[PDB]
């Protein structure tokens, strides 16, 4: 239980580095068929600069995007944080493309995690169609943590990943509660049970009152897939991103 402090330090160090232009663009880039650590801060900026030329300069490109400056330091919506942190955690020498992974559609999450080598770290990538949400469950070698951010347009309020990591990143989640939330039956549980699991697991202040279950899609699919990872690899990927200066 001094690996928990390593893990916290790595995330902390990672999130703080994102104030750097180069780190920011390398973390959240959306080329997925290539290694995270193969990302080149300056190719990326050239491709940004090309698309701002293509669209009549920055002021015009901004109107087209409804205000979004592509050069700015960003923080990602849920899918983009999910995809990229997934890559950072799981990559060594083979690209992993979170965009083409095979999901479980008819497995129960509890039935899935019982299947896992307790001697390995896993990360689970949850595509939750009830919440319209995508997020990570880190299962280090059982103990669970959530990695996520959120646009804010569904049952859960907006959250920046930097802030999520800061408050929640190193705060273990109840597996039982995870079993319940990632149930097919979750859709059918009582209001107050749904809002409490969502609060407990997914809301930065563990506050039920900031959950709105009217925006749940009761017929949403819940998809997940796991992938083992070497902690040292994760640390290393995060050292490259963080070291970009």
């Amino acid at each position: 239980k001094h690996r928990v402090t390593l893990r916290k330090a790595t995330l902390a160090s990672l999130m703080q580095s994102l104030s750097g232009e180069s780190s920011n663009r390398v973390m959240w880039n959306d080329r997925y068929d290539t290694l995270l650590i193969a990302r080149d801060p300056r190719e990326i900026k050239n491709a940004i600069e090309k698309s701002v030329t293509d669209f009549g300069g920055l002021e015009n490109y901004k109107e087209l995007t409804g205000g979004a400056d592509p050069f700015a330091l960003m923080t990602p919506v849920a899918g983009l944080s999910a995809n990229n942190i997934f890559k950072l955690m799981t990559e060594k020498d083979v690209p992993i493309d979170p965009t083409s992974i095979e999901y479980l559609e008819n497995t129960s999450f509890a039935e899935h995690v019982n299947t896992l080598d307790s001697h390995k770290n896993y990360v689970v990538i949850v595509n939750d169609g009830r919440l319209g949400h995508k997020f990570l469950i880190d299962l280090p070698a059982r103990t669970a943590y959530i990695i996520q951010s959120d646009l804010g347009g569904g049952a859960l309020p907006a959250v920046r990943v930097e802030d999520w990591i800061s408050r929640r990143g190193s705060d273990p989640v109840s597996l039982d509660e995870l079993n319940q939330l990632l149930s097919k039956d979750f859709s059918k549980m009582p209001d107050d049970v749904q809002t409490r699991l969502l609060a407990s697991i997914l809301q930065i202040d563990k506050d039920p009152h900031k959950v709105d279950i009217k925006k749940l899609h009761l017929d949403g699919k819940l998809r997940f897939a796991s992938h083992e990872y070497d902690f040292r690899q994760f640390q290393r990927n995060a050292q490259y991103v963080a070291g970009l200066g």
């Binding site: 959306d30 491709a47 409804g66 319209g132 959120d150």
Partner: protein
Amino acid sequence: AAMLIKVKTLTGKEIEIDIEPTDKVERIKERVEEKEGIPPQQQRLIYSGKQMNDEKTAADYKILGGSVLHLVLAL
């Protein structure tokens, strides 16, 4: 009548989607999701400077072959 549209992100990353004028916006988001791994509710899908109505169609926004929709993945 089939048409190829471009969806371009803030990174300049481009994808081509072959659509029809009758296809709904929600549908276009789902197929972006096939490609990019973003849940439709997590997408800010933008054409002519504004976000698009999920129940409205591509024809509703006068989208044509070659039209570029902007996918912004930032808060």
